[PDB]
């Protein structure tokens, strides 16, 4: 039986927060709300279905951080002419994953930006 402020599903506990934070802060905050806590992770479509609903029922339409960060930083970025990648002029340093409370689609947002979020931990 998850803490009074949380919701249970498949042996796990989930809880959506209204305090706006960038990705890193959100993840760190989750590790402080209960042992083994982290930003919500969607290992299956069923889990995502639960979380999206929980999130929308609680705060309605909004955007919530998911446990994925720096998603393209270590990708194989290459120039089409095969020139070596040295000089750089990125508008943003990194992108993180989040979801809009209306559906379980995965979306990207600059990690430095703000959003609400959902924490999770294994009971």
């Amino acid at each position: 039986d998850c803490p009074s402020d949380w919701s249970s599903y498949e042996g796990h506990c989930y809880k959506p927060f209204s305090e706006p934070k960038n990705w890193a802060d959100a993840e760190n905050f989750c590790t402080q709300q209960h042992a083994g806590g982290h930003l919500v992770s969607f290992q299956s479509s069923e889990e995502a279905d639960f979380v999206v609903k929980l999130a929308f029922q609680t705060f309605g339409h909004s955007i919530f951080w998911m446990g994925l960060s720096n998603v393209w930083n270590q990708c194989n970025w290459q120039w089409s002419n095969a020139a070596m990648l040295r000089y750089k002029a990125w508008a943003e340093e990194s992108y993180c994953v989040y979801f809009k409370s209306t559906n379980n689609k995965w979306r990207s947002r600059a990690c430095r930006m703000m959003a609400q979020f959902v924490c999770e931990f294994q009971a």
Binding site: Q43, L68, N70, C75, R107, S108, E120
Partner: protein
């Protein structure tokens, strides 16, 4: 030393196109405008300034981005990315347009900053040979 219509900068020729194409079609089109053609590769601040000026003088849209040749080669949605909980990512539900693995120059940042954008977008571009 460059074909009519193209501009020369430090040993290479550049040409801006106001055509709206996807990154794939743009890159391919460039490979056909000249031998060794490709979408522009911005390798120094000077070349970035040269390209920005070229774009400002031949695109002027106040909207839409301008393709550059840098993108993620593979076809993956996320690279070496693991859930913060420590588990591996297997299941995923990305909106294709949310996977911004291509880059474009934009007016708001003077055409000198690389903005992560969806590769399926249809934008103008600059070729380099």
């Amino acid at each position: 030393d460059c074909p009519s219509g193209w501009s020369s900068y430090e040993g290479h020729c550049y040409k801006p196109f106001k055509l709206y194409k996807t990154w794939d079609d743009a890159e391919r089109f460039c490979t056909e405008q000249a031998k060794g053609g490709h979408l522009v590769s911005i390798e120094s601040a000077g070349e970035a300034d040269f390209v920005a000026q070229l774009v400002t003088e031949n695109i002027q849209n106040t909207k839409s981005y301008v393709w550059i040749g840098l993108r993620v080669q593979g076809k993956e949605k996320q690279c070496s990315s693991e859930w913060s909980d420590g588990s591996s990512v297997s299941y995923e539900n990305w909106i294709e347009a949310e996977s911004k693995t291509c880059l474009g120059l934009e007016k708001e940042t003077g055409f000198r900053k690389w903005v992560n954008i969806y590769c399926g977008q249809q934008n103008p571009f600059v070729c380099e040979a």
